[model samples]
Each structure stands twice: as C-alpha cells, then as structure tokens.
Target: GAMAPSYRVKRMDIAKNDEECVVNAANPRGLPGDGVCKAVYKKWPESFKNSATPVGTAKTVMCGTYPVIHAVGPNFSNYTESEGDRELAAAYREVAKEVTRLGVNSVAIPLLSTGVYSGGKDRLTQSLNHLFTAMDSTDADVVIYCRDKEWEKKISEAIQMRT
Candidate 1:
C-alpha cells in the first residue's frame, strides 16, 4: 500500500530519546512538585508557560536544545467530568495543529485520555486517531512513544489498523 507523505506513525517503547522532539503522554498540569514536567521546566526554564490552561485536551511544552515539542495529555486528577474530556480533546487538537504549523519535524505523544482519567478510553482513542490522521496527511514524522508494554502494544496495533 502507498503511504502518505505528510506524516508517519510509529510506536516506540522508550520515553525520552535524543531527538529533535519528544512527545510525552502526560498530564498538562505539571505535577505540583515533581515528575517529568518539573524536570523539563528546570532544564528549559524559558519554555514554561502557564498563561493558557488546557481544559480537557493535551498541552505542548518545548524542551531541550533540539526544538522538541512535548505534547502532554490531560491530567486525570483535575478532570472529573465528560465536559473535561471533550475540552481536553479539543485542546490537544489545537496544540497539535500549532505544532505542525511551526514546522516541527517530529512529534511524540502518549495515550492522552488514558491513565488516571478513567473511563476516557473512547475519547482518548478518538483524539489519537484524529491527530494521527492529520499527521499522516502532512509532511511530518509523528512518533507515538509509550513507557510500558501495554501502551506500546495498544499504540502499535492502532497505528497498524489505521495505516
């Protein structure tokens, strides 16, 4: 089968890679005190921004010197309703569009609606499908990186099904 030139989707097991960009399937709200967000903020103090809050969707933050954009998923702890899920999906789509517009060569993403935000599998899956479809139609390399085996399997299967 012929593939699209706009984007390519691949599944990876590692979280962080020494590349142009790394997408994190994480909470938009950086942890109050710890975790990847804090570490990333410390490493790239200038990339941190709190001006715009992502209601239900994913958020993007730049990290490292390679111009990598980290697209974080929703924070389950803060989202407690279906409205939040919709908001998060909308937010993620907007962020992704901006990322592509900025000419980012590569992007990494996590299972946005999964994890702590329980019962959001359908929403999350739809969001991912939308994002991947857009990417695949563009000239970008989109990589979905997962931290665990289960996540890796799910993403891999999904990508295969889509392509």
Candidate 2:
C-alpha cells in the first residue's frame, strides 16, 4: 500500500474541504435532491440535471472553483444486500476513475448512500469498506468527510482495521 493514495477521515462539511475535487452522492437520475447532493447543487446550481446517471457509474461537473464527481450510488432499500454491496463498490470505483481522469491531486468524498438513501444496520460499515477500498486505488489524496460524530468515530475506528 506504500504507493497507494493516502486516506483521511474528517468530521467536516465536504463543501468546505478545499480539495481539488469533491464527490456528491447523487441519485440514480442525477438529481441533487438532498444531503451532499443538495449542498453541492446549492453552490453550483447548474452542475446537475434531470438526466439518468445509472447506478454504479459517475460523471464530473465543474462547480466554478472545483469539479464535483456526481456518483450514482445504489438505493440500498431497493436491492438485495449483496446486490447493494456490489453496486456501492462499483459506484466508488467510478469515483476513483473520475479522480484519475480529472488529474486531481486531492478529493473529498462523503459516505455515499448513508443518509436519506441508506437502509439496514450494516450500511455504514459497508460504505466505509467499499469507499475506502476504491479510493485506495486512486492516485490522489483522499479525505472521507462526514458531519455526524458517530460516523466520524466509526470511520476512524474502521481505518485501524484497514491499516
């Protein structure tokens, strides 16, 4: 893992992370409805549209100062647990692909699908595992940001297991 990108867990707003790029957990149709999506949309109103952004894929939109990688993560409640897991992993892989394509040195990503779109008790752990694993393959510095204290604590602890 020596040459892999570095990962950091931060309890802060992703919009304020000051990274070269930020990731938005958008809906399958690329709607900026709520949570991180809403935040990013509020700042860069034209970045997203009512277009289909199929699950397990992503697209980049420039938000004035930085680009936002709008990733369409699975709506967990709509799929089987294993299916949701694979979709989530694929979504983050797309995010990594965007990061590399944009040639960004750093990126701030939130725990995708864990807010209004989240389902089940194990969603957080699953997101942490998949998100971190995907980012581990990128060349940029990665910051996993969340506003919840419990999520922050869990992510910090999870980092230990990965290390």
Candidate 3:
C-alpha cells in the first residue's frame, strides 16, 4: 500500500493552479445562477453553452490551458428529495475514475452540489464527506477549492448525511 491516497481541503484560486483540470459544479443549462457556471463562462466563453450531462457523467471542455470537467452533480431545486447525496457520491466516483483514466493526477473540485443546486453549506459538507470516502482508496489527489475562509469553512463543515 503506497499511501491510500491522501486528500486535503484548502482555499485556492482555480485559475492560478496550472496543469490541473478545473472541475465545476455543473448544470445542463449553464445558467448564471449557478456560481461555478458563471465563473466558467467568464473564464472561457466556449466552455459552457446551456450544456450539461448527468451524474457519473462528465463532459470535458477546454478552459484556456486546463480542461473543465462539467460533471452534472446534483439537483438542488428539484422538488424531489433524498436523491442528491447518493447521486453526488456516485458522480464523484465517476469523476475520479475519469480523471484517473486521463492520466491526470491533480483535480480542483469545488462543492459540486451546493448553491443554486440548493442545500447550501450543510448539504455540501455531508455530500462531500462521502466524496472523501469514495476516493479514500484512490490514487488521485484532489484540492477542494474555495474562494476564501468562509467558503472553505462551509465545505469543511460538510459531513453526515452519510450512508
């Protein structure tokens, strides 16, 4: 066993991190309401175009020097309930696998299910704990990106909602 794949939560600027794929919390619509989508659009106009996919699915798009993995993470506003956490965990598994397949060792993953997707801080933390566990055994090293301390705190606080 080499290291069981270590992971760390940090506040980092995605664009500043080179040689890495900038993973965004995606939507089929790529609306401005989605924080990650907005940022993507600002960075690379061609990255999003009312575009989307599904959980456990990834659409790779170019973002200047990095590739953006627009993985449709979770449905926050959906009237339906109890599906987001499970779907997000599965999606994380898939995203991790995809990155590994591409020979990419580094990933900048944001809170893929929070914000306009609903279930803000608590929801994100809980869902992402499952992410940590899902990739607990993988070889990839993910830098959970956040804008600042508060956002980082929110992601860091995510826990429970476990399976």
Candidate 4:
C-alpha cells in the first residue's frame, strides 16, 4: 500500500526510547545476539538464559516491560537482517498482532537488511517498500529507523519510486 501523502511515516535515529517499547527476536535457545537478539542483549540478556522461554518467529517476548515484539528475522549478528528476503517480512507479519497489542503510541524499526543484507538496490527497494505493508497502522507512530542519513535517503527514494 502506497503511503497517503498525508500519512505519517518518518525516518529517524532510534534514540530517546525511554517511553517507547523496544522489540526483540528470541532464538530456540533463548540466546541474544544479532538482529533483534542484539537489541535484546543490548537491553537485557540476563533474563532468557537457562530459562524455559519458548521461542519462534511468531513469539513476541516483552523485556524491559514494554508491550512488545522481537524475533531473532528467522534473528541477528552475522546473518543478514533478513531485509528484502521473504522470511523477514513473513516473520514480522506472523507476529503482527503483538504490534498493535502492545498498546503503545510509538515504535521504531531499523531497516532489517540495510547493512550486511542490503542486497541489490532494486531488491532492497522492493523489500523495504513491502515492509510498509507488513505492518498494521491502527494507531501510533511507526518509525522505520536507519543507522545513518544515507540509508534513510535511499529508502525514501525507493518509497516514492514510480512504477
């Protein structure tokens, strides 16, 4: 779905999330690393070890007490962030409910594959553009984050691309 000209989607750094919830992807072992797992560790790694936390792409475990989501894209580190690949979008959609269920007003998602998994330009464009549709816009500011301005610029260019 093309964003309405009045629709609100913005690109920004993922800072100042004090009041917002952060998401994560947990592995079968419940270990934290790479992709969404990295974010989990960056927030709280001591929680899932040697514990009976069941894991899968469809699960959204809330750490740091945010109404939340996290998948480690099928989730993180050396593996590409699964951007543009079918699995990434599918996995997120699988857990799409936890998104609106979180009951928060704002969320931020770094480009899933913008780094190591950037893929080729056209493919990345298709990937990120479709990511827009994967999400539900019931209410809230869903910000797609990027590490730097260059990535955001390219993604915006991709978003407005004409058929």
lDDT of 1 by residue, 1-163 (tens): 1144333334444334433555444444544224444444555555555523444444455544544344454555566666555655565566567566667665555555555554534454666665665455555556665446665666667767745
Model 3: per-residue Cα lDDT over 57-155, one tens digit each: 667777565677777777756634567666777777777776776666677777667666664444655666766866666676667766668767666
Ranking by TM-score: 2, 3, 1, 4
Which regions of candidate 3 deviate over 4 angstroms? 1-5, 30-33, 49-51, 148-163
* Stretch of 10 with least lDDT, candidate 3: 154-163
- Candidate 4 segments whose C-alpha is farther than 4 A from its true place: 1-19, 25-29, 46-56, 74-84, 116-123, 158-163
Question: What is each predicted model's overall lDDT from 0 to 1?
Answer: 0.51, 0.81, 0.64, 0.50
The prediction achieving the highest TM-score against the true structure is 2
Q: Alpha-carbon error at 4 in model 1, in Å? A: 5.2
**TM-score to true structure, per model:** 0.64, 0.89, 0.75, 0.61
Q: Which of the two, 2 or 4, has more TM-score?
A: 2
Tell me the spans in candidate 1 whose CA falls farther than 4 Å from its real position: 1-15, 24-46, 49-52, 56-65, 68-81, 119-127, 133-137
Clashing pairs in 1: 6-138, 6-139, 6-140, 23-108, 56-87, 56-88, 57-87, 57-88
Mind giving the per-residue lDDT tens digits that candidate 4 earns over 16-128? Answer: 34336544444546655455456556666555544223323545555457534544343233335443255667655644456666766665555454453344332445546
Which model is ahead, 1 or 3, in terms of lDDT? Answer: 3
Ten-residue region with minimum lDDT total, candidate 4 = 1-10
Top of the candidates by lDDT: 2
The positional error of residue 124 in candidate 1, measured at the CA in angstroms, is 5.8
